[PDB]
Amino acid sequence: XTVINLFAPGKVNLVEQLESLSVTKIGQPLAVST
Amino acid sequence: XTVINLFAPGKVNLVEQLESLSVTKIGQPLAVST
Amino acid sequence: MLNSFKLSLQYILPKLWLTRLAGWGASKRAGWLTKLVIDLFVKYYKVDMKEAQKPDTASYRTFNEFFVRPLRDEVRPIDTDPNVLVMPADGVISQLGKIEEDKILQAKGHNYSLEALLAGNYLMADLFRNGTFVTTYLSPRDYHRVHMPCNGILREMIYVPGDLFSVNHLTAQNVPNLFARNERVICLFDTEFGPMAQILVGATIVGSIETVWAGTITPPREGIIKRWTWPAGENDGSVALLKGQEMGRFKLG
Amino acid sequence: SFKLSLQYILPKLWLTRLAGWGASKRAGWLTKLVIDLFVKYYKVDMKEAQKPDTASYRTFNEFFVRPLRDEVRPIDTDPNVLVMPADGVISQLGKIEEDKILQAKGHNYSLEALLAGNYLMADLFRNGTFVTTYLSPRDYHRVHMPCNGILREMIYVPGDLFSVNHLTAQNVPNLFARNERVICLFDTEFGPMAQILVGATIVGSIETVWAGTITPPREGIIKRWTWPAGENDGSVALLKGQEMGRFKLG
Ligand SMILES: CCCCCCCCCCCCO[C@@H]1O[C@H](CO)[C@@H](O[C@H]2O[C@H](CO)[C@@H](O)[C@H](O)[C@H]2O)[C@H](O)[C@H]1O
Ligand code: NA
Ligand code: NA
């Protein structure tokens, strides 16, 4: 296994399509700067 | 089990008779202010 | 109380001794027997060997060599918007979203403490209260190395002893503090997006954790918290990593 | 050496919970029998107990945490004297050599590791003084204040339940830094003071007088409580030789 990321308040927005059980692939968008 | 005491540097002197395997009893002297 | 044979095994099974036994076996050069176990694994978990640099299962001398196999670069293009942070790991999102003050979601309806995940480090928790979290689960079929979401200067690493519970829907729903009680490595970075933590959490069998700067962190398991620090990026002795670069991995043992 | 290997093989936590279950049972004649066998084998001095009558204890744990008659533990009256918090024997004592505390001849452990990586708390005690007291099965199992103290911080630290004896003190690395323990930090007239209660196999249950039973349960995470400075609402103050906590089975 498990990787946990933490980001500071106000700093990133998670890509809106991602939810529990969304497939992840290295290099694909996770979050965007605010 | 075990009790560990920590004291700040230069604050107490351990009574000089105490060593490894000295019998302890609650209320008996352990240390003195410097 | 949930009366569940499978759940009770999590508490009865000698998870540490099974993890050490698996690490012993996975480190062995066992020729045909290595290849057999890898082939059974590849079949049962539906591993995609076409993404691997070495697609031939005979090319791996040890099961652990196979478990940590590299991918062909072409197959994981790194997004080029510098405003975009990318997924550090192949697998599936477990949970993600807002850190609700000190609370992170483990499963629908089940929270755990940010401060507990960070081994009682309230100064580090102060960086992330009301922030954002992402939990990625890597399954046996997935690539087991972990890459950077963005450019980062490494500032702090914390090794946290803990349990080796399995991670699945059953334990996510029923084991309190699952990720805060499992053996893990906390990595804290300075980034363009402020402080960022990337935490590698072990599980039963898959209990060995490496970083690219420190090598194998575990095993062995010395039972104590260990802390490393590095200076700010402008200073001698700093460690910097780029977006999509390898930062660590998991393996058996 | 066989005995050392068992430390790593034995289901220490399940044996501790089994003993806790048994020790919490109001089992009449069987409670009294186990107490009497224990008193015989460990040569317990029941004359020092408030209730010397072994039938007066409804649970083995009630017996294990038995109070003493006040007369038999007179508290030193020099206000410049700190007193022993526990009946037993000194394991090791002396100077904290920068971050290093002596476990046994030729084995050190880290002050920061004992304090579960709390570097700000370690900074209070670097180059300070430590005392490690071992309580045996025959000893009184409550722990008393070495001096007047205002409680400021308590930290519950999950960990192992290794046995504590000469063999493990000599051979188990980080014995006290890896065992389940409760760290208590006080303001005193002699500066910051820590009193740390470290569990062992069987004797794994830790209480304080302000919080009750800290463990069990064992929820696998560090927990931290804070209290204000003295003479503030919510403050917790204890006098020299007052009871501050105890150990029991479970
Ligand atoms: C999930 C984990 C499961 C992974 C699958 C494999 C696990 C099975 C464990 C069985 C033990 C096999 O043990 C393995 O035997 C072969 C014999 O060919 C040895 O082979 C190697 O070392 C021996 C000497 O030690 C040399 O003579 C030999 O030329 C060399 O290649 C390995 O060094 C040994 O590690
Ligand atoms: Na192998
Ligand atoms: Na180990």
Numbering used by the authors:
A (entry chain B), B (entry chain D): 254 to 287
C (entry chain A): 1 to 253
D (entry chain C): 4 to 253
Question: Please, what does the article write about this entry?
Answer:
Phosphatidylethanolamine (PE), a major component of the cellular membrane across all domains of life, is synthesized exclusively by membrane-anchored phosphatidylserine decarboxylase (PSD) in most bacteria. PSD is translated as an inactive proenzyme and undergoes self-cleavage between a conserved Gly-Ser pair to become an active αβ-heterodimer. This maturation step results in the post-translational modification of the N-terminus serine to pyruvoyl in the α-subunit, which is an indispensable prosthetic group for decarboxylation activity. After the proenzyme undergoes auto-proteolysis, an active complex is formed between the α- and β-chains, which are mainly responsible for catalytic activity and membrane association, respectively.
Using native and selenomethionine-derivatized recombinant PSD1–287, the crystal structures of apo PSD1–287 were determined from two crystal forms at resolutions of 1.90 and 2.63 Å, which are described as Apo-PSD1 and Apo-PSD2, respectively. The asymmetric unit of Apo-PSD1 contains two αβ-heterodimers, whereas that of Apo-PSD2 contains four. Two out of three molecules of N-dodecyl-b-maltoside (DDM), a detergent used to solubilize the enzyme, were located at the interface between two adjacent β-subunits, augmenting the dimerization of αβ-heterodimers in Apo-PSD1. Interestingly, DDM molecules identified in the structure of Apo-PSD1 interact with the positively charged surface of PSD through the relatively polar disaccharide moiety, whereas the dodecyl tail of the detergent interacts with the hydrophobic surface of the enzyme encompassing the N-terminal helices. These molecular interactions may mimic those occurring on the cellular membranes, where PSD is partially embedded within a single layer of phospholipids using the N-terminal helical domain. Estimation of the protein-membrane border in bacterial cells is further aided by co-crystallized DDM, the length of which roughly encompasses a single membrane leaflet. The N-terminal pyruvoyl residue (Pvl-254) of the α-subunit was unambiguously identified in both apo structures. Gly-253 of the β subunit, which is no longer connected to Pvl-254 after auto-cleavage, is approximately 12.6 Å apart when the distance between two Cαs is measured, and it forms a salt bridge with the side chain of Arg-221. Consequently, Pvl-254, which is located at the base of the funnel-shaped active site, is open for substrate binding.
